[PDB]
Each structure stands twice: as structure tokens, then as C-alpha cells.
Amino acid sequence: MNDQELRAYLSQAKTIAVLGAHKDPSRPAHYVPRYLREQGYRVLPVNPRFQGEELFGEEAVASLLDLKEPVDILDVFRPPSALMDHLPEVLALRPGLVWLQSGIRHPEFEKALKEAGIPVVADRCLMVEHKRLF
């Protein structure tokens, strides 16, 4: 995937689910999605730690399976050691593209996603890359 193709995914994306969404405005799990929301994206916060609480103008749900609409981009902020347990959720949800934030890689998780036919982008910040490309 090149910038040109990555642009087609970003510019086409409507919903961006944030796995690991945070409330503290100091963390990336919050300011990255916040930046995304201000760019015309409908970010859907997902985090058991803040379930029921409003974030980015939406109620935070505990699971990806709790989301109502399809997901264009799954922006992941959860650490590598917490990814395999969520694999079945991501496979079921089947987002158009799974995005692993900075400092997050997991060979197995990524392979499983690729084998399922789901595009993956890892160790990259969605805010930084969106800024770059557009």
C-alpha cells in the first residue's frame, strides 16, 4: 500500500472506531481521535474503562461488538499483549482497515487479520499520517 492507496482509504473513511479510547486529553488515545473528529470523521470510542461515558460526542461502549454501524477504520491503541484476546472481535466486526498505533506491533495478530483478508497498517499514528497525506 502506497500513499495514493492509503489516501483512498482515509478520504473514504467515515467511521473510525477507537480501541482503547481515553478521556485524559494528555494521551494519544484521546487527542488523536479528537483530531480525527475535527476532520470530518465519526469516531466511535470503545473502552471498558470508560463505558457509558461520553467521548468525542459519543457514548463509550465496552466492546467492538457493541457498535451499531459498520467500521471503516479500527484505530487501535491497546498494547501488543492485549491484542490477541480481541482478535475474535475484530474478525467478527471485520472493519475495512485495522490501524495499529505507534509502538504497537504483533506478528500473529497481524497475520491472522491478513489471512482473513483485512488490510492492516501498524506502528503509525493516524493523526500524523492523516496530516502528512492531506
Short mmCIF file of N, CA, C and O in Angstrom, two decimals:
data_model
loop_
_atom_site.label_atom_id
_atom_site.label_comp_id
_atom_site.label_asym_id
_atom_site.label_seq_id
_atom_site.Cartn_x
_atom_site.Cartn_y
_atom_site.Cartn_z
N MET A 1 0.84 -1.23 0.00
CA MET A 1 0.00 0.00 0.00
C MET A 1 0.86 1.26 0.00
O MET A 1 1.76 1.42 0.82
N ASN A 2 0.57 2.17 -0.93
CA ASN A 2 1.30 3.42 -1.03
C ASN A 2 0.45 4.57 -0.52
O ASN A 2 -0.70 4.38 -0.12
N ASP A 3 1.02 5.77 -0.54
CA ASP A 3 0.31 6.97 -0.09
C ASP A 3 -0.98 7.13 -0.86
O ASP A 3 -2.02 7.44 -0.29
N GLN A 4 -0.91 6.93 -2.17
CA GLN A 4 -2.08 7.06 -3.04
C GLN A 4 -3.21 6.14 -2.60
O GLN A 4 -4.36 6.57 -2.50
N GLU A 5 -2.89 4.88 -2.33
CA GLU A 5 -3.91 3.93 -1.89
C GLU A 5 -4.35 4.22 -0.47
O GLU A 5 -5.54 4.13 -0.16
N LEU A 6 -3.40 4.58 0.40
CA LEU A 6 -3.73 4.89 1.78
C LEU A 6 -4.61 6.14 1.85
O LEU A 6 -5.37 6.33 2.80
N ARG A 7 -4.52 6.98 0.83
CA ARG A 7 -5.32 8.20 0.77
C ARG A 7 -6.78 7.84 0.45
O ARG A 7 -7.71 8.43 1.01
N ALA A 8 -6.96 6.87 -0.44
CA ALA A 8 -8.29 6.42 -0.84
C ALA A 8 -9.06 5.82 0.33
O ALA A 8 -10.29 5.90 0.38
N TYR A 9 -8.34 5.21 1.27
CA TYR A 9 -8.96 4.61 2.44
C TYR A 9 -9.34 5.68 3.45
O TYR A 9 -10.43 5.65 4.03
N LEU A 10 -8.43 6.62 3.66
CA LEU A 10 -8.65 7.69 4.61
C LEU A 10 -9.76 8.64 4.16
O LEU A 10 -10.68 8.93 4.92
N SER A 11 -9.67 9.12 2.92
CA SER A 11 -10.67 10.05 2.40
C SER A 11 -12.06 9.42 2.25
O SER A 11 -13.07 10.12 2.22
N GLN A 12 -12.10 8.09 2.16
CA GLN A 12 -13.36 7.37 2.01
C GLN A 12 -13.96 7.03 3.37
O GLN A 12 -15.18 6.91 3.52
N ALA A 13 -13.08 6.88 4.35
CA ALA A 13 -13.49 6.54 5.70
C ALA A 13 -14.48 7.53 6.31
O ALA A 13 -14.34 8.75 6.17
N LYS A 14 -15.49 6.99 6.98
CA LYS A 14 -16.49 7.80 7.65
C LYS A 14 -16.35 7.51 9.13
O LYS A 14 -16.11 8.41 9.94
N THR A 15 -16.49 6.24 9.49
CA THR A 15 -16.39 5.84 10.88
C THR A 15 -15.02 5.31 11.25
O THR A 15 -14.43 4.51 10.52
N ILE A 16 -14.53 5.77 12.39
CA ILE A 16 -13.24 5.34 12.91
C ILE A 16 -13.50 4.89 14.34
O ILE A 16 -13.83 5.70 15.20
N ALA A 17 -13.38 3.59 14.59
CA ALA A 17 -13.57 3.06 15.93
C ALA A 17 -12.24 3.19 16.63
O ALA A 17 -11.20 2.89 16.05
N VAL A 18 -12.26 3.65 17.88
CA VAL A 18 -11.02 3.81 18.63
C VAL A 18 -10.94 2.79 19.75
O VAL A 18 -11.59 2.94 20.78
N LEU A 19 -10.15 1.74 19.54
CA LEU A 19 -10.00 0.72 20.57
C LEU A 19 -8.98 1.20 21.58
O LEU A 19 -7.79 1.32 21.27
N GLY A 20 -9.44 1.46 22.80
CA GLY A 20 -8.56 1.95 23.83
C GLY A 20 -8.75 3.45 24.04
O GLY A 20 -7.91 4.10 24.65
N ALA A 21 -9.85 3.98 23.51
CA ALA A 21 -10.18 5.40 23.64
C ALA A 21 -10.02 5.85 25.10
O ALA A 21 -10.43 5.15 26.02
N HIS A 22 -9.42 7.02 25.29
CA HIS A 22 -9.18 7.54 26.63
C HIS A 22 -9.84 8.90 26.84
O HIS A 22 -10.15 9.61 25.89
N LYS A 23 -10.05 9.26 28.10
CA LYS A 23 -10.66 10.53 28.45
C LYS A 23 -9.60 11.60 28.67
O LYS A 23 -9.76 12.75 28.23
N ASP A 24 -8.52 11.23 29.36
CA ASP A 24 -7.43 12.17 29.64
C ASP A 24 -6.95 12.79 28.33
O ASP A 24 -6.43 12.09 27.46
N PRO A 25 -7.12 14.11 28.19
CA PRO A 25 -6.71 14.80 26.96
C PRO A 25 -5.20 14.83 26.71
O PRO A 25 -4.75 15.29 25.66
N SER A 26 -4.43 14.32 27.66
CA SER A 26 -2.98 14.29 27.51
C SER A 26 -2.48 13.08 26.72
O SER A 26 -1.39 13.11 26.15
N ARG A 27 -3.28 12.02 26.68
CA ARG A 27 -2.89 10.79 25.98
C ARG A 27 -3.33 10.74 24.53
O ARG A 27 -4.35 11.32 24.15
N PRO A 28 -2.56 10.01 23.69
CA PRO A 28 -2.86 9.86 22.26
C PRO A 28 -4.23 9.24 22.02
O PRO A 28 -4.92 9.58 21.06
N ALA A 29 -4.63 8.33 22.91
CA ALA A 29 -5.92 7.66 22.81
C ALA A 29 -7.06 8.66 22.86
O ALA A 29 -8.22 8.32 22.59
N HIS A 30 -6.73 9.91 23.20
CA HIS A 30 -7.73 10.96 23.24
C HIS A 30 -7.50 12.07 22.22
O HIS A 30 -8.40 12.39 21.45
N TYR A 31 -6.30 12.65 22.19
CA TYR A 31 -6.04 13.74 21.25
C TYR A 31 -5.94 13.34 19.78
O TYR A 31 -6.15 14.17 18.90
N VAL A 32 -5.63 12.08 19.51
CA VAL A 32 -5.58 11.62 18.12
C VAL A 32 -7.02 11.52 17.62
O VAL A 32 -7.36 12.06 16.56
N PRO A 33 -7.89 10.80 18.36
CA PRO A 33 -9.29 10.68 17.92
C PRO A 33 -9.97 12.06 17.88
O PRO A 33 -10.81 12.32 17.04
N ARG A 34 -9.58 12.93 18.82
CA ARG A 34 -10.14 14.27 18.88
C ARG A 34 -9.77 15.02 17.60
O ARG A 34 -10.59 15.74 17.03
N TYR A 35 -8.54 14.84 17.15
CA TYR A 35 -8.09 15.50 15.93
C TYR A 35 -8.87 14.92 14.75
O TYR A 35 -9.26 15.64 13.83
N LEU A 36 -9.08 13.61 14.77
CA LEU A 36 -9.80 12.93 13.70
C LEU A 36 -11.24 13.46 13.61
O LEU A 36 -11.73 13.77 12.53
N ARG A 37 -11.90 13.57 14.76
CA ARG A 37 -13.28 14.06 14.80
C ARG A 37 -13.40 15.45 14.18
O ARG A 37 -14.37 15.75 13.50
N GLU A 38 -12.41 16.29 14.43
CA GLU A 38 -12.43 17.64 13.88
C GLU A 38 -12.15 17.63 12.38
O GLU A 38 -12.25 18.67 11.71
N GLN A 39 -11.81 16.47 11.83
CA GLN A 39 -11.51 16.36 10.41
C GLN A 39 -12.65 15.73 9.60
O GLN A 39 -12.44 15.31 8.45
N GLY A 40 -13.83 15.66 10.19
CA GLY A 40 -14.97 15.10 9.48
C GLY A 40 -15.23 13.62 9.65
O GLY A 40 -16.04 13.04 8.93
N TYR A 41 -14.53 12.99 10.60
CA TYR A 41 -14.71 11.55 10.84
C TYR A 41 -15.62 11.31 12.04
O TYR A 41 -15.60 12.07 13.00
N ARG A 42 -16.40 10.24 11.97
CA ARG A 42 -17.27 9.89 13.08
C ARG A 42 -16.52 8.86 13.92
O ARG A 42 -16.54 7.67 13.63
N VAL A 43 -15.84 9.33 14.96
CA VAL A 43 -15.08 8.42 15.80
C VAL A 43 -15.94 7.81 16.90
O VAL A 43 -16.63 8.51 17.65
N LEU A 44 -15.91 6.48 16.96
CA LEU A 44 -16.67 5.70 17.92
C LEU A 44 -15.75 5.14 18.98
O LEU A 44 -15.00 4.20 18.72
N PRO A 45 -15.80 5.70 20.20
CA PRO A 45 -14.95 5.24 21.30
C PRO A 45 -15.34 3.87 21.87
O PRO A 45 -16.51 3.60 22.13
N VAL A 46 -14.34 3.02 22.05
CA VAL A 46 -14.55 1.69 22.61
C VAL A 46 -13.50 1.44 23.68
O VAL A 46 -12.30 1.40 23.39
N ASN A 47 -13.95 1.31 24.92
CA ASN A 47 -13.07 1.05 26.06
C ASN A 47 -13.89 0.72 27.29
O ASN A 47 -14.69 1.54 27.76
N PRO A 48 -13.73 -0.50 27.82
CA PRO A 48 -14.48 -0.89 29.01
C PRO A 48 -14.23 0.08 30.17
O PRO A 48 -15.13 0.35 30.96
N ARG A 49 -13.01 0.61 30.25
CA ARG A 49 -12.64 1.53 31.32
C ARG A 49 -13.47 2.80 31.39
O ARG A 49 -13.56 3.42 32.44
N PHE A 50 -14.08 3.18 30.27
CA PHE A 50 -14.89 4.39 30.23
C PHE A 50 -16.29 4.15 29.66
O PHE A 50 -16.93 5.07 29.17
N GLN A 51 -16.75 2.90 29.73
CA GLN A 51 -18.06 2.54 29.21
C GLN A 51 -19.18 3.38 29.82
O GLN A 51 -19.20 3.61 31.03
N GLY A 52 -20.10 3.83 28.97
CA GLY A 52 -21.21 4.64 29.44
C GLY A 52 -20.88 6.12 29.47
O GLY A 52 -21.78 6.95 29.54
N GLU A 53 -19.60 6.44 29.42
CA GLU A 53 -19.16 7.84 29.45
C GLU A 53 -19.06 8.41 28.04
O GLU A 53 -18.74 7.69 27.09
N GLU A 54 -19.33 9.70 27.91
CA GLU A 54 -19.28 10.36 26.62
C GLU A 54 -17.87 10.80 26.23
O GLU A 54 -17.16 11.43 27.02
N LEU A 55 -17.48 10.46 25.01
CA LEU A 55 -16.16 10.82 24.48
C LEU A 55 -16.32 11.16 23.01
O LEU A 55 -16.95 10.41 22.26
N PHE A 56 -15.76 12.29 22.60
CA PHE A 56 -15.83 12.74 21.22
C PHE A 56 -17.29 12.83 20.76
O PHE A 56 -17.61 12.60 19.59
N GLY A 57 -18.16 13.19 21.70
CA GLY A 57 -19.57 13.33 21.38
C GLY A 57 -20.33 12.03 21.18
O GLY A 57 -21.39 12.03 20.54
N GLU A 58 -19.80 10.94 21.71
CA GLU A 58 -20.44 9.63 21.59
C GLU A 58 -20.27 8.86 22.89
O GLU A 58 -19.31 9.07 23.63
N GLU A 59 -21.21 7.96 23.18
CA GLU A 59 -21.13 7.16 24.40
C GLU A 59 -20.13 6.03 24.21
O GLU A 59 -20.23 5.27 23.25
N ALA A 60 -19.17 5.94 25.12
CA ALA A 60 -18.16 4.90 25.03
C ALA A 60 -18.74 3.53 25.36
O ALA A 60 -19.38 3.35 26.39
N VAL A 61 -18.53 2.56 24.47
CA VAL A 61 -19.01 1.20 24.68
C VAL A 61 -17.82 0.35 25.10
O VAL A 61 -16.67 0.70 24.84
N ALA A 62 -18.09 -0.77 25.76
CA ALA A 62 -17.03 -1.64 26.25
C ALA A 62 -16.45 -2.56 25.20
O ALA A 62 -15.28 -2.93 25.28
N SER A 63 -17.25 -2.94 24.21
CA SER A 63 -16.76 -3.85 23.18
C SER A 63 -17.05 -3.37 21.76
O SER A 63 -17.94 -2.55 21.53
N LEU A 64 -16.27 -3.89 20.81
CA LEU A 64 -16.43 -3.54 19.41
C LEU A 64 -17.77 -4.08 18.92
O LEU A 64 -18.39 -3.52 18.01
N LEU A 65 -18.20 -5.17 19.54
CA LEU A 65 -19.45 -5.80 19.17
C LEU A 65 -20.65 -4.98 19.64
O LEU A 65 -21.79 -5.29 19.31
N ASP A 66 -20.38 -3.92 20.40
CA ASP A 66 -21.43 -3.05 20.91
C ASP A 66 -21.74 -1.91 19.95
O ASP A 66 -22.72 -1.19 20.11
N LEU A 67 -20.89 -1.74 18.94
CA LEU A 67 -21.07 -0.68 17.95
C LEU A 67 -22.28 -0.96 17.06
O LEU A 67 -22.58 -2.11 16.75
N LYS A 68 -22.97 0.10 16.65
CA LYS A 68 -24.17 -0.04 15.83
C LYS A 68 -23.94 -0.01 14.32
O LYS A 68 -24.58 -0.75 13.58
N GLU A 69 -23.03 0.85 13.87
CA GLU A 69 -22.75 0.97 12.44
C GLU A 69 -21.45 0.27 12.05
O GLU A 69 -20.62 -0.02 12.91
N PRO A 70 -21.26 -0.01 10.75
CA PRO A 70 -20.03 -0.68 10.30
C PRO A 70 -18.84 0.23 10.55
O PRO A 70 -18.99 1.45 10.63
N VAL A 71 -17.65 -0.36 10.67
CA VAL A 71 -16.44 0.41 10.94
C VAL A 71 -15.50 0.46 9.74
O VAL A 71 -15.08 -0.58 9.22
N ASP A 72 -15.16 1.67 9.32
CA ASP A 72 -14.27 1.89 8.20
C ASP A 72 -12.82 1.71 8.61
O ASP A 72 -12.04 1.07 7.90
N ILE A 73 -12.45 2.28 9.75
CA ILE A 73 -11.09 2.16 10.25
C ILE A 73 -11.11 1.85 11.73
O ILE A 73 -11.83 2.50 12.50
N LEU A 74 -10.34 0.85 12.12
CA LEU A 74 -10.24 0.49 13.52
C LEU A 74 -8.90 1.00 14.01
O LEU A 74 -7.86 0.40 13.74
N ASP A 75 -8.93 2.14 14.70
CA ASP A 75 -7.72 2.77 15.24
C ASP A 75 -7.43 2.14 16.59
O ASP A 75 -8.13 2.41 17.57
N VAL A 76 -6.40 1.30 16.64
CA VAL A 76 -6.05 0.59 17.87
C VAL A 76 -4.96 1.23 18.73
O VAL A 76 -3.86 1.54 18.25
N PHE A 77 -5.27 1.41 20.01
CA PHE A 77 -4.35 2.00 20.97
C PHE A 77 -3.97 1.01 22.08
O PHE A 77 -3.14 1.32 22.94
N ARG A 78 -4.56 -0.18 22.04
CA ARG A 78 -4.28 -1.21 23.04
C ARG A 78 -2.89 -1.81 22.82
O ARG A 78 -2.47 -2.02 21.68
N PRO A 79 -2.16 -2.10 23.90
CA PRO A 79 -0.81 -2.68 23.81
C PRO A 79 -0.79 -4.07 23.18
O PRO A 79 -1.78 -4.80 23.22
N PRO A 80 0.36 -4.46 22.59
CA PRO A 80 0.53 -5.77 21.94
C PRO A 80 0.04 -6.96 22.76
O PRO A 80 -0.55 -7.90 22.21
N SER A 81 0.28 -6.93 24.06
CA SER A 81 -0.12 -8.03 24.93
C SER A 81 -1.62 -8.12 25.16
O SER A 81 -2.09 -9.05 25.81
N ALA A 82 -2.37 -7.17 24.63
CA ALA A 82 -3.82 -7.17 24.81
C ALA A 82 -4.56 -7.35 23.49
O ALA A 82 -5.79 -7.32 23.46
N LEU A 83 -3.81 -7.57 22.42
CA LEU A 83 -4.41 -7.71 21.09
C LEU A 83 -5.00 -9.07 20.72
O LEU A 83 -6.06 -9.14 20.09
N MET A 84 -4.33 -10.16 21.09
CA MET A 84 -4.81 -11.49 20.73
C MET A 84 -6.18 -11.83 21.32
O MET A 84 -6.99 -12.52 20.69
N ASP A 85 -6.46 -11.32 22.52
CA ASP A 85 -7.75 -11.58 23.15
C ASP A 85 -8.89 -10.90 22.40
O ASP A 85 -10.03 -11.36 22.45
N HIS A 86 -8.59 -9.81 21.70
CA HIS A 86 -9.60 -9.07 20.94
C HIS A 86 -9.74 -9.54 19.49
O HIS A 86 -10.65 -9.12 18.78
N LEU A 87 -8.84 -10.42 19.05
CA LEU A 87 -8.85 -10.93 17.69
C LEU A 87 -10.22 -11.38 17.17
O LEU A 87 -10.61 -11.02 16.06
N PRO A 88 -10.96 -12.19 17.95
CA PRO A 88 -12.28 -12.64 17.50
C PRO A 88 -13.27 -11.49 17.27
O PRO A 88 -14.13 -11.57 16.40
N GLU A 89 -13.13 -10.43 18.07
CA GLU A 89 -13.99 -9.26 17.95
C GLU A 89 -13.71 -8.53 16.64
O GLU A 89 -14.62 -8.20 15.89
N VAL A 90 -12.43 -8.29 16.39
CA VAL A 90 -12.01 -7.60 15.18
C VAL A 90 -12.36 -8.40 13.93
O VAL A 90 -12.71 -7.83 12.90
N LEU A 91 -12.25 -9.72 14.02
CA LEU A 91 -12.57 -10.58 12.88
C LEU A 91 -14.07 -10.53 12.61
O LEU A 91 -14.50 -10.44 11.46
N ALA A 92 -14.86 -10.58 13.67
CA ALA A 92 -16.32 -10.52 13.56
C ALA A 92 -16.73 -9.16 13.01
O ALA A 92 -17.47 -9.06 12.03
N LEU A 93 -16.23 -8.10 13.66
CA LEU A 93 -16.53 -6.74 13.25
C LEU A 93 -16.12 -6.54 11.79
O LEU A 93 -16.81 -5.87 11.02
N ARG A 94 -14.98 -7.11 11.43
CA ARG A 94 -14.44 -7.01 10.08
C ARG A 94 -14.40 -5.58 9.55
O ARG A 94 -15.06 -5.25 8.56
N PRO A 95 -13.61 -4.71 10.19
CA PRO A 95 -13.52 -3.32 9.72
C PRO A 95 -12.82 -3.27 8.37
O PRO A 95 -12.10 -4.20 8.00
N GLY A 96 -13.02 -2.18 7.63
CA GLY A 96 -12.39 -2.05 6.34
C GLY A 96 -10.87 -2.00 6.44
O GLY A 96 -10.16 -2.37 5.51
N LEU A 97 -10.37 -1.55 7.59
CA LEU A 97 -8.93 -1.44 7.78
C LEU A 97 -8.58 -1.34 9.26
O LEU A 97 -9.18 -0.57 10.00
N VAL A 98 -7.60 -2.13 9.68
CA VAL A 98 -7.17 -2.11 11.07
C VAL A 98 -5.88 -1.29 11.14
O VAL A 98 -4.92 -1.55 10.40
N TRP A 99 -5.87 -0.29 12.01
CA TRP A 99 -4.71 0.59 12.16
C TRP A 99 -4.10 0.46 13.55
O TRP A 99 -4.75 0.75 14.55
N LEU A 100 -2.85 0.01 13.61
CA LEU A 100 -2.17 -0.14 14.89
C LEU A 100 -1.31 1.10 15.15
O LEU A 100 -0.41 1.43 14.39
N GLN A 101 -1.62 1.78 16.25
CA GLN A 101 -0.91 3.00 16.62
C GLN A 101 0.57 2.79 16.95
O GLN A 101 1.06 1.67 17.05
N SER A 102 1.28 3.91 17.11
CA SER A 102 2.71 3.91 17.40
C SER A 102 3.15 2.99 18.53
O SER A 102 2.56 2.96 19.60
N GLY A 103 4.22 2.24 18.26
CA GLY A 103 4.75 1.33 19.26
C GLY A 103 3.93 0.08 19.47
O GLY A 103 4.07 -0.61 20.48
N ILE A 104 3.06 -0.22 18.51
CA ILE A 104 2.22 -1.41 18.62
C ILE A 104 2.33 -2.30 17.40
O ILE A 104 1.95 -1.92 16.29
N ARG A 105 2.88 -3.49 17.61
CA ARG A 105 3.04 -4.49 16.57
C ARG A 105 2.77 -5.84 17.23
O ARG A 105 2.97 -6.00 18.43
N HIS A 106 2.30 -6.79 16.43
CA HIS A 106 2.02 -8.14 16.91
C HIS A 106 1.95 -9.02 15.68
O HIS A 106 0.92 -9.09 15.01
N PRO A 107 3.06 -9.70 15.35
CA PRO A 107 3.15 -10.59 14.18
C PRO A 107 1.94 -11.50 14.00
O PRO A 107 1.33 -11.52 12.93
N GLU A 108 1.59 -12.23 15.06
CA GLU A 108 0.46 -13.15 14.99
C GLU A 108 -0.85 -12.45 14.67
O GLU A 108 -1.53 -12.79 13.70
N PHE A 109 -1.21 -11.47 15.49
CA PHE A 109 -2.43 -10.70 15.31
C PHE A 109 -2.53 -10.18 13.87
O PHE A 109 -3.56 -10.35 13.21
N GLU A 110 -1.47 -9.55 13.38
CA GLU A 110 -1.44 -9.01 12.03
C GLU A 110 -1.61 -10.10 10.97
O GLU A 110 -2.33 -9.91 10.00
N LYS A 111 -0.93 -11.22 11.17
CA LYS A 111 -1.02 -12.33 10.22
C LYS A 111 -2.46 -12.83 10.13
O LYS A 111 -3.01 -12.99 9.04
N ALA A 112 -3.06 -13.07 11.29
CA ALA A 112 -4.44 -13.55 11.37
C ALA A 112 -5.39 -12.62 10.62
O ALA A 112 -6.30 -13.07 9.92
N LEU A 113 -5.18 -11.31 10.78
CA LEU A 113 -6.00 -10.31 10.11
C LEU A 113 -5.81 -10.37 8.60
O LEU A 113 -6.78 -10.34 7.83
N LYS A 114 -4.55 -10.46 8.17
CA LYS A 114 -4.20 -10.54 6.76
C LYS A 114 -4.76 -11.80 6.12
O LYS A 114 -5.21 -11.78 4.97
N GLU A 115 -4.73 -12.91 6.86
CA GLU A 115 -5.26 -14.17 6.36
C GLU A 115 -6.78 -14.08 6.21
O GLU A 115 -7.37 -14.76 5.37
N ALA A 116 -7.40 -13.23 7.03
CA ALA A 116 -8.84 -13.03 6.98
C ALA A 116 -9.17 -12.07 5.84
O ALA A 116 -10.34 -11.88 5.50
N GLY A 117 -8.14 -11.46 5.27
CA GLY A 117 -8.33 -10.53 4.16
C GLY A 117 -8.56 -9.09 4.59
O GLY A 117 -9.00 -8.26 3.80
N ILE A 118 -8.27 -8.79 5.85
CA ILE A 118 -8.45 -7.45 6.37
C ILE A 118 -7.15 -6.67 6.29
O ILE A 118 -6.12 -7.11 6.81
N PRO A 119 -7.16 -5.50 5.62
CA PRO A 119 -5.95 -4.68 5.50
C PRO A 119 -5.44 -4.22 6.86
O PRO A 119 -6.23 -3.94 7.77
N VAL A 120 -4.12 -4.15 6.99
CA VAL A 120 -3.51 -3.73 8.25
C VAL A 120 -2.40 -2.70 8.04
O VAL A 120 -1.61 -2.81 7.10
N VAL A 121 -2.38 -1.71 8.92
CA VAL A 121 -1.36 -0.66 8.92
C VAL A 121 -0.92 -0.62 10.38
O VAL A 121 -1.75 -0.44 11.26
N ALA A 122 0.37 -0.81 10.64
CA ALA A 122 0.86 -0.83 12.02
C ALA A 122 2.01 0.12 12.33
O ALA A 122 2.69 0.61 11.43
N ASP A 123 2.22 0.36 13.62
CA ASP A 123 3.28 1.25 14.09
C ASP A 123 3.26 2.57 13.33
O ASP A 123 4.26 2.97 12.72
N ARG A 124 2.12 3.24 13.38
CA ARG A 124 1.93 4.52 12.70
C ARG A 124 0.82 5.27 13.42
O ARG A 124 -0.12 4.65 13.92
N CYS A 125 0.91 6.59 13.47
CA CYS A 125 -0.13 7.38 14.12
C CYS A 125 -1.08 7.88 13.05
O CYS A 125 -0.66 8.51 12.07
N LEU A 126 -2.37 7.59 13.23
CA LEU A 126 -3.39 8.00 12.27
C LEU A 126 -3.45 9.52 12.11
O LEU A 126 -3.74 10.01 11.02
N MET A 127 -3.17 10.26 13.18
CA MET A 127 -3.18 11.72 13.11
C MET A 127 -1.98 12.22 12.29
O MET A 127 -2.13 13.07 11.41
N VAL A 128 -0.81 11.67 12.58
CA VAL A 128 0.41 12.05 11.87
C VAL A 128 0.32 11.72 10.38
O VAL A 128 0.69 12.54 9.53
N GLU A 129 -0.17 10.53 10.06
CA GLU A 129 -0.31 10.10 8.67
C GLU A 129 -1.41 10.86 7.93
O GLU A 129 -1.30 11.12 6.73
N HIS A 130 -2.48 11.21 8.63
CA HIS A 130 -3.57 11.96 8.00
C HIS A 130 -3.03 13.34 7.66
O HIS A 130 -3.27 13.87 6.56
N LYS A 131 -2.29 13.92 8.60
CA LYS A 131 -1.68 15.23 8.41
C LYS A 131 -0.78 15.20 7.18
O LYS A 131 -0.87 16.05 6.29
N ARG A 132 0.10 14.20 7.13
CA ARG A 132 1.03 14.05 6.02
C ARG A 132 0.34 13.97 4.66
O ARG A 132 0.57 14.81 3.79
N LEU A 133 -0.51 12.97 4.50
CA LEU A 133 -1.23 12.73 3.25
C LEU A 133 -2.19 13.81 2.76
O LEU A 133 -2.34 14.01 1.56
N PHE A 134 -2.85 14.51 3.69
CA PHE A 134 -3.80 15.55 3.30
C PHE A 134 -3.39 16.95 3.72
O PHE A 134 -2.21 17.14 4.11
#
